[PDB]
């Protein structure tokens, strides 16, 4: 009866991808050099002697965030710097209270610790970061003002984005020889606004895992429980932001790759409506793919910081001036609403995969807190989630895995477990014709109208829902994306936010009524039978708040009210 | 050079069957033709000076006839030569009644249809009752229902109209009767508009012309020999003639801008996703590579402005169409010509334009220079790639949907339908990976032209709308001057220049006779030009802006049209 993932692998035979002889001779040496270059880039003064070997700390469900504070690994000054929001860091630097250099060195120290525990970096360049921070301070001297609203703010970057004069491989070994001549659009906007760069974070092979396994650096771990995954495909972003190793992180999101790592790893994350933030200039298999377009967006330890980043990026970076796809729709100024003014529809169960006890409890606690503050809540049974799930998963692969196969077979690198999984997602290697792709588009538009009509006609402001049917999964053991992928096919702006609740092994267990549940699918059984109270201790619970399309500003404004109602302070 | 040379991409052998069509479908078409004849208000009709076939052969100017024979009363002329902006003010003031405004336009619409054959459905009687409800509401409440209260508006047939046949030009859909308006016509209704006519379009909606098996050909109101354009064929004719205050069309390939430019009026192709296209009949379900667009057509640019501002900020399309962007229609002032930088396309690199287009473009350029504007002569890059890419996008489903809709009735194929079914690789059904490569090329082209405009501080691009004035019916082949801006998706104003073809000027010069054709298609188009068979055709041109700067395109169109002193009333 127990489900093994291999029985799903019947859509792509996976026989024209791997070849261990060719990989070992032609590509493995370049990977080893890449690994050695990362080790050489770790500053020893910022490193530490681990309390036990890392793999023992993993078995032990070590909480690295607790250790950082309890062992006081940073000075009081570094803690004081690195536990301020980017918003107040920006005001302090602009007012001459902090140098950019001193702000950088604290985050640089904290990021090296983050890597030593979570394995969240793919590239480290602390020295170049230092020189950038120096230029920032030089500029402030000479001119008496800052370069822009992110002046001196250390920001971590997902690896797959083009970085000028550095390898950009997007998790594909075949691309380890790809060195772009310039930043991608989003990175060069961040630099012009004044940001400081120093670390590029890990991602899974194929960029289609809610996890991190890749052939360069292996697995990235959760900073609140080192047995667990930090998520993906923005894996290192969730780890480093959740640890505080940077002030803001930048990821991308098809299928959930911003919201899931944020929720898994203890921070906040925004998936914006498509075409506000540029995705131009990076490595992925998505060239020309428009049926469910990817999206880029920020992650941080406060909603103010998400808001700062959007406002600065759009209104000052003006991405439409260098990326024709980006919309010139201003980031509007919106007041924080009162909880009693909000109507919130609640998804307790998407109709596909039942959520585990910690998610059920945290969702229930948040709903009751909202009700108590005066919000109109609607209990919402979301329609056509099965059609939405099937349509979007067909969309992922409807080129017959042509591009993924080309990028993977170019190096013959060994296939990861969750790579085999996502290569079999829809009809796998079946290559759709144009007419059949257009029919999927029609379905998408019907779903979008069905849901938009629900919120318009019922005066619903937001939809509150789980991010995943569990807290952070064990590495290489996360299979169902339904809770995040729904908002990709609908393209609704969705905030992933920490509730302030953590799994409790003495209380987050199945009830006796739960044990007589009848599973609706093999996938639901696979996911639910992995939940074990003793093996997910203390993992944060993050939930999703979705708004109507292009109302991102209201999403963050209400997110700010809700996090304040809940007392969430990640600093 | 003959057009048959190009027809090697779709064998066209599973579309038409005369015996099936004759037996099962033609009876329904004839009933539809007879309902149109019965719906023409017989009092509003006129006795034609010669039979329509002789008027056509004589290049009859129906618009001159309308004014010189004074077919409308002074009062009707005064009503139908006000812009919709002034009409809406006067109605809301109480100086005019909606019934009174309607009857004037219903009369001039009947005349338009009599000369140009621009109507596919007429329902003046229902329109009249709508106008009564507007007047009743104004008395009962002292205010208007919205910014378009009592304004008569023509609608392209293919958009859904509640409880009426909506066939999009496919005989097989003469059975399709929607239960509600399309999104845009439902928004215009709520803004106060009045409906009475649905205008003609070609078979497949993919001609810059009108040929179709319901009503035949629609002709140019300024020269009945010439096409009125397409695929918004009846809108060009009826708005150019003044039979409606504002018209509503759709534009892939050119189908708003070409009919406006050909038939003597103005039209705006907006940036995609501002105006809804939801709720209509076409072969484009799910097609996203080159999204179709809807937009307005009128005899003044102020009216296009009024239509867009009202539609977006008051209609709020995003509340019923999740595809439409909640992007406010911004208030922008009219610029001074001296503050503009304008790039000029005199030749797109593919099809040389004919003497009247070349002369009219040059005159406008000299007017703009003379008023202080900075002029950049512009050789537009990669137009060959842009042409091939967009025409491949048109057909990359192997003509599956077009053939499904046509073969459902087995209706006979029009000449220019054969032409467009051979546009890409025709019946070659692309796989997804190939379609994604077209999307990649589209985005490289957009960035190249966006980079041009941004790096050189260019406000607008000025260019022809077509390599000739209005074409002869069924003899328009090259879409490159309009289709360039569909693949780039730049907002593009088609504006009349005030200039008209003049047979004494507008001959090929002697050096023109030494020109070496770059392609069969360029020869095919250029040899159709003859100064004596295009007399007095109006010249419209294109003003293109940066994506989502529609508001600036119209504001500068207001300025350029006034510098040229163009008054279509």
Outline of chain A, from the CA principal axes?
globular
CATH superfamily of chain A: Amidase signature (AS) domain
Distance between the termini of chain A: 45 Å
Give me the Rg of chain A, rounded: 22 Å
The amount of beta strand of chain A, in percent, is 5-15%
Q: What's the domain count of chain A?
A: 1
CATH class of chain A equals Alpha Beta
Structural class per helix/strand content of chain A? Answer: alpha/beta
User: Largest chain-chain contact?
Assistant: A-B, 41 and 42 residues
Known CATH architecture of chain A: Alpha-Beta Complex
Strand order of the largest sheet of chain A: 1-3-2-6-8-7-12-13-11-9-10
- Give the count of helical stretches of chain A: 19
Number of strands of chain A: 13
Oligomer: homodimer
Helix content of chain A: 25-40%
**Largest sheet data of chain A:** 11 strands, mixed
CATH topology of chain A: Amidase signature (AS) enzymes
Would you give an account of this structure?
- Two copies of one chain form a homodimer.
- Chain A has helices spanning 20-40, 54-59, 64-70, 76-82, 86-94, 100-118, 126-143, 185-192, 235-243, 259-265, 303-317, 357-372, 385-397, 402-409, 417-423, 434-457, 482-490, 522-528, 552-565; strands at residues 121-124, 155-158, 199-201, 221-222, 225-229, 248-252, 268-271, 296-300, 343-346, 376-379, 462-466, 494-502, 540-546.
- In chain A, α11 runs antiparallel to α19.
- Helices cover 39% and strands 11% of the residues of chain A.
- Chain A is of the alpha/beta class.
- In chain A, the strands form two sheets. Chain A has an eleven-stranded mixed β-sheet with strand order 1-3-2-6-8-7-12-13-11-9-10, with helices on both faces. Chain A has a two-stranded antiparallel sheet with strand order 4-5.
- Chain A has a single domain, classed as Amidase signature (AS) enzymes, CATH 3.90.1300.10.
- The termini of chain A are far apart.
- Chain A binds chain B through residues 280, 287-291, 320-325, 327-329, 398-400, 402-403, 431-435, 437-442, 445, 448-449, 451-453, 456, 549-551, and chain B through 285-289, 318-323, 325-327, 396-398, 400-401, 429-440, 443, 446-447, 449-451, 454, 546-549.
- Chain B: This is amidase.
